[PDB]
Amino acid sequence: GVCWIYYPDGGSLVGEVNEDGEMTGEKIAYVYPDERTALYGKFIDGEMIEGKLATLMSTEEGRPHFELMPGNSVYHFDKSTSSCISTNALLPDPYESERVYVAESLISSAGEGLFSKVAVGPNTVMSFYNGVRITHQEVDSRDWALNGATLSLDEETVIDVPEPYNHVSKYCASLGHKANHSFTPNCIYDMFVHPRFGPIKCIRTLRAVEADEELTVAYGYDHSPPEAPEWYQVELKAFQATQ
Amino acid sequence: SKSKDR
Ligand SMILES: Nc1ncnc2c1ncn2[C@@H]1O[C@H](CSCC[C@H](N)C(=O)O)[C@@H](O)[C@H]1O
Ligand code: NA
Known part of the structure; x- marks a missing residue:
């Protein structure tokens, strides 16, 4: 049966x-x-x-x-392409909507961040990271100013949420690109097979999180190629000193 | 790589 x-x-x-x-x-x-x-x-x-x-x-x-x-x-x-993020960019994911919201980050000068709506346990999928699908070649050969929301999916594909879709007024079908970086994160990026987005990544808690706690992930840039945006290099220096 | 989590 x-x-x-x-x-x-x-x-x-x-x-x-x-x-x-x-x-x-x-x-x-x-x-x-x-x-x-x-x-x-x-x-x-x-x-x-x-x-x-x-x-x-x-x-x-x-x-x-x-x-x-x-x-x-x-x-x-409705899998994304290189040029189309979604057929319904303003239609939220119903699972994600009950778990996270976007608000001003608690991290200084970090723009918006992603927050837990409710208390959850470890290993909980919170949010989806969908975006357009482009090549590592395209991403690696352009300036960091364009690579704020790029996430490697596999050896051939990078997921991106380019302007203006990094504004929730233009795109809110998924919100994983709104989670800020921490070297002491409470979440990880994990593989996810989504019925709407197809094979993407998600944000998964590594520990229990309280209601209204900011969700953070290690962005995991190469520290010894540091190939990273300036703000990350500055916070990496800070982190390394606390060690 | 100019992308996260590679
Ligand atoms: N730890 C940190 N310190 C400073 N800026 C951060 C940060 N983590 C993320 N950011 C910012 O967030 C961008 C990646 S996208 C994350 C969501 C973003 N803050 C937004 O408002 O849409 C980076 O380009 C950087 O501007
Ligand atoms: Na299930």
Whole structure:
């Protein structure tokens, strides 16, 4: 009967597979890593065609029972390209929206930062880092002023949130690019397979975090190639002294 | 590399 297929990050696809063993049907769901928030509806071979926001209320004999959320929030597989970040740049991720918000950073002169909405435990996925997909060659050969929000995805791809999409008034489908740097972070970047964004990275807590605590990540620039923006070099000197 | 987390 029903099958659950988990990703390493804890998200899953669940439903009755078809005669070919594929996640294809009108009652398939992607379930986020809270094992509660779900996108339920039409999938073809595990690709989300029309996922409606739902809550996983219970399971019976392994079968998930959902309640659809009010409204008509629907989502589809919408992987970015080199030039298009999203078909719905202003449509937030529903899992992320209940976990983080953007506000002025507590770090001096650091602009906006990303904050926890609620108290969470260690190993909790908080936020998604989606962006356009460009090459290391393009990124490495341009000035640092353009590389504020670049995140390496793999050996071939860098994810970027370029102007003006680094303003939430123009892009808020994901918010991972809003987390500031710390050499003593409370989060890490981790691999994530998202039903809307595809293979991206996420921000995951490494320890318990309180409500309204700023989320920080080590940006992990090369210290001995330091190939890094000036503010990072300045704080690296500071960090190294406390050691 | 001019990107994070490489
Ligand atoms: N520890 C730190 N100190 C100073 N500036 C920081 C910082 N961590 C991040 N930043 C700033 O944040 C940018 C990366 S994007 C992070 C979100 C950004 N503060 C925003 O308002 O959208 C960097 O270019 C730098 O301007
Ligand atoms: Na799950």
